From Swiss-Prot, chain A:
It is found in: Nucleus; Nucleus speckle. The chain holds residues 377 to 415 of 1304 of the full protein. Belongs to the SF3B1 family. There is a cross-link at K37 (Glycyl lysine isopeptide (Lys-Gly) (interchain with G-Cter in SUMO1)). Transmembrane segments: none annotated. Component of the 17S U2 SnRNP complex, a ribonucleoprotein complex that contains small nuclear RNA (snRNA) U2 and a number of specific proteins. Part of the SF3B subcomplex of the 17S U2 SnRNP complex. SF3B associates with the splicing subcomplex SF3A and a 12S RNA unit to form the U2 small nuclear ribonucleoproteins complex (U2 snRNP). Within the SF3B complex, interacts directly (via HEAT domain) with SF3B3, SF3B5, SF3B6 and (via HEAT domain) with PHF5A. The SF3B subcomplex interacts with U2AF2. Identified in the spliceosome C complex. It comes from Homo sapiens. There is a cross-link at K37 (Glycyl lysine isopeptide (Lys-Gly) (interchain with G-Cter in SUMO2)). The modification Phosphoserine is found at S24. This is Splicing factor 3B subunit 1. Phosphorylated. Phosphorylation occurs concomitantly with the splicing catalytic steps. Component of the 17S U2 SnRNP complex of the spliceosome, a large ribonucleoprotein complex that removes introns from transcribed pre-mRNAs. The 17S U2 SnRNP complex (1) directly participates in early spliceosome assembly and (2) mediates recognition of the intron branch site during pre-mRNA splicing by promoting the selection of the pre-mRNA branch-site adenosine, the nucleophile for the first step of splicing. The gene is SF3B1.
From Swiss-Prot, chain B:
Component of the 17S U2 SnRNP complex of the spliceosome, a large ribonucleoprotein complex that removes introns from transcribed pre-mRNAs. The 17S U2 SnRNP complex (1) directly participates in early spliceosome assembly and (2) mediates recognition of the intron branch site during pre-mRNA splicing by promoting the selection of the pre-mRNA branch-site adenosine, the nucleophile for the first step of splicing. Residues 8-83 form the RRM domain. The lineage of its organism: Eukaryota, Metazoa, Chordata, Craniata, Vertebrata. This is Splicing factor 3B subunit 6. InterPro entries: Nucleotide-bd_a/b_plait_sf, RBD_domain_sf, RRM_dom, RRT5_SRSF_SR, SF3B6_RRM.
């Protein structure tokens, strides 16, 4: 059973899955102030 | 294994006005699949852009490598996206509402840049 440090590694894993999760265009559009054109 | 401020969205300043879509993809796309690019196109936004990567590790890589990057007579300034900074130009009230909405709905960090 996972020792304290490998639990940290496992948490880092979960954390980045959330930070690398695919974003909808709606999520994305809301991140932005006026005055930008989409290339 | 990476810092909380890193993010797939890069904010870019000191960008040449004449720069083309192809050149943007060329420059930024070197570090991996580009989700989308948005280029400022008003008096208050020209010379700036947001570049979005598909993957956060590519974005860290681009961000580590592209600040100070020479294109034309210029050196690009590239920063991780930050919602607080991003909505600066809204008067004190509207900025507060907009930030509260992105936090509620999406859970984005809403504090000013670290």
């Amino acid at each position: 059973s996972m020792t304290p440090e490998q639990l940290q590694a496992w948490r880092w894993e979960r954390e980045i899955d959330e930070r690398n999760r695919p974003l909808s265009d709606e999520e994305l559009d809301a991140m932005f102030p006026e005055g930008y054109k989409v290339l | 294994r990476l810092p909380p401020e890193v993010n797939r969205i890069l904010y870019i300043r000191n960008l040449p006005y004449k720069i083309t879509a192809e050149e943007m993809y060329d420059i930024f796309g070197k570090y991996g699949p580009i989700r989308q690019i948005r280029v400022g196109n008003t008096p208050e936004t020209r010379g700036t852009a947001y570049v979005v990567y598909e993957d956060i590790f590519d974005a860290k890589n681009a961000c580590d490598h592209l600040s100070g990057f020479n294109v034309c007579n210029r050196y690009l300034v590239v920063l991780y996206y930050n919602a607080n900074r991003a909505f600066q130009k809204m008067d004190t009230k509207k900025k507060e509402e907009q930030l509260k909405l992105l936090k509620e709905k999406y859970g984005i960090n809403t504090d000013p840049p670290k």
